[PDB]
């Protein structure tokens with residue numbers, strides 16, 4: 001996250017921190033995710049494309065920090081790693097960039113809600129809020145696009161939904177953005193999601209309820225003018241989600 005603020009897991013209790021085990025024993029951060037039900041976390045396919053082995057991953061919930069332990073955190077393994085069959089990408093844009101991970105503890109249990117862990121609601125089919133709406137994004141991603149390191153503390157910021165007709169503009173993304181994606185950006189372009197934030201939530205208030213409207217996918221650079229954040233559009237994937245979580 002560029003700009004925005006530091007926060008704790010309690011302010012985003014659905015955020016899932018996803019790491020990969022490295023052969024030879026080292027573990028590194030891969031991507032964020034969101035807890036949509038007790039046993040299921042939703043994220044972005046491109047996070048996992050180069051290493052599709054479910055055994056390679058660990059999912060933490062209730063975790064406020066990247067490389068140090070948060071009290072109340074719960075650790076899981078991936079029982080099922082579902083990547084979207086229609087995933088494709090360019091140098092820039094990613095399509096059908098959505099994934100599910102089914103989590104189970106070694107003890108065999110799905111997540112249990114607490115102070116630090118809550119599920120997030122899915123939207124209703126094809127139901128997104130109007131352009132102009134302020135949503136929030138959360139991640140362990142770079143604080144600036146040139147950084148070598150990720151912050152150690154979780155961050156969030158606020159961005160406003162942009163129009164497709166508008167994200168369509170040549171100055172913006174043109175052809176690259178489809179109806180399976182949503183765009184969001186700061187009006188002055190000062191805050192945005194950056195590498196490391198992918199898989200993470202775009203959360204908007206829809207019908208008096210915090211709702212998972214998007215998944216962090218791609219953008220050109222991080223917080224660059226005329227180049228908004230692009231997000232997988234959850235409301236247009238419910239059938240995929242329901243089918244694959246049945």
Ligand SMILES: N=C(N)NCCC[C@@H](C=O)NC(=O)CNC(=O)[C@H]1C=CC(=O)N1
Nearest residue numbers: 193194195196198218219220221222229
């Ligand atoms: N919101 C913005 N601006 N970017 C979100 C970046 C999320 C990131 C997470 O892993 N996604 C990607 O890196 C996917 N690939 C990219 O964003 C490509 C496109 C330009 C570039 O610099 N790298």
